[PDB]
Amino acid sequence: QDAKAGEAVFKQCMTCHRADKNMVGPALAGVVGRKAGTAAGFTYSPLNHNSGEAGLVWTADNIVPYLADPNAFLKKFLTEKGKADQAVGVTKMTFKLANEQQRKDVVAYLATLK
Ligand code: HEC
């Protein structure tokens, strides 16, 4: 949860993500508190879109486990909601971050991206 230390982790996210514009991935400014699959102008996968449609809002707490394994997180979310059939595909985000402290720091960084 050290946002300054999260800057260095955020350099990897900048391959695909900017704060205000879409690129390979959606724009991330305001992502903490945003309904999944809704950055204006971004075309999301069905797995991410259906997760937000089922109510998923990204928070400082749930982005941490998400970053360890995006597919697993989103599948488990829709399964828990009784919507396992909507989680058969995969996300466009092919990156994963294993280290828990790095995930917590980068999420503290994201929370400052207003
Ligand atoms: C390119 C290889 C990426 C890397 C590096 C990072 N992300 Fe990503 N992210 C990528 C895509 C293509 C998408 C769209 C996913 C889909 O299935 O449509 C995403 C999505 C996210 C999200 C969800 C955003 C939303 O629902 O609006 C988050 C919270 C996210 N990505 C965070 C994130 C972080 C913090 C990264 C660095 C640690 C990171 N991503 C790397 C592509 C890529």
Structural class call reads mainly alpha
Q: What profile does the largest beta sheet have?
A: none
Task: Label the CATH architecture.
Answer: Orthogonal Bundle
Bound ligands, named by name, code or SMILES: heme C
What's the helical proportion of residues?
Answer: 40-55%
CATH topology: Cytochrome Bc1 Complex, Chain D, domain 2
Broad CATH class? Mainly Alpha
Q: What gross morphology would you assign? A: globular
CATH superfamily: Cytochrome c-like domain
Return Rg in Å. 13 Å
**How many helices does DSSP assign?**
5
Approximately how much beta-strand content do the residues carry?
under 5%
PDB class: electron transport
Keywords: electron carrier, heme protein, cytochrome, C2, reduced, rhodopseudomonas palustris, electron transport
Assembly: monomeric
Entry title: structure determination of the ferrocytochrome C2 from rhodopseudomonas palustris
